[PDB]
Amino acid sequence: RPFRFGVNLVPTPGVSSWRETCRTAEQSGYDVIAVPDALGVHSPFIAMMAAAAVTERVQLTTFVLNSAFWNPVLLARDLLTAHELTGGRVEAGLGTGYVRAEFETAGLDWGTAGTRVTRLADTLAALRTLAVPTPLMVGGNGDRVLGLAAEHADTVSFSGATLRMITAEAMDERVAFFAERAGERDSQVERNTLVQSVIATDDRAATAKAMRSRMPYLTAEQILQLPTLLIGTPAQMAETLLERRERFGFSYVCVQERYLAAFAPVIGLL
């Protein structure tokens, strides 16, 4: 599947640079602007509308909605609106939330991991029943969550962390688990991952060795294979993404805002 590149931008209250940042993302060659769903961050669909007003090509996605925050019928109303009023430029990533304090602040029941995943399941079923027109992305690494992606999603997003970084070998197993659950639908589901750090260096080996300090549970060789890290020159990173599309099927690759400019050269090469 052809590469699609995203940058995960944080629209921040009290900061006046949102539209400028979105323009920079598009001008730097990104295909997608992703926004989070968190307290103390701008509201996602409203921020996506502001981004759509100053960009022409990028898709806009949530990455990812906290399912505890949304009534499925009212979310379907939001998604239909966002789709129609942007000319079909909005995608909706959904998942579970991991910050209990946000549940507490909003007056929502934290419950159990089981009830949080059931809420995601119930929302996805309702959105599909209501035939929402936005493409749906499901993110996580849990067995039930990947099963829900396999059943419902247009795009599955594999987390490269639990932050504890997951090895390439663990990622092999998660992608295979998803693929088995997806069955005949596997080929219709785009695969995404988020790269946490884009580390430009002329000495990847020396860089990985020093990084064992921050990831003592890994060898340097494992660090150089972690799907959540890109290390080296732009040419080396481009080659690494080609290899990881072959290995994992990852064609939709996102990076964090801090690395927007660091990663842009890789887009130029790919």
Author numbering: 25 to 186, 196 to 303
Article sentences:
Central to this pathway is PepI, an F420H2-dependent oxidoreductase. PepI first catalyzes the formation of the central statine, then produces the C-terminal statine moiety.
Overlay of Adf-acetone adduct structure with kvPepI-F420 revealed that the keto group of the acetone adduct occupies a position similar to that of the ordered water (HOH570), suggesting that the highly conserved His62 acts as a general acid to protonate the keto group of 9. Accordingly, the H62A mutation abolished the PepI activity. To rule out the possibility of H62A mutation causing a loss of activity due to allosteric effects, we also solved the structures of kvPepIH62A and kvPepIH62A in complex with F420, which are virtually identical to kvPepI apo and kvPepI-F420 complex structures, respectively. Taken together, these findings strongly support the role of His62 as the proton-donating residue.
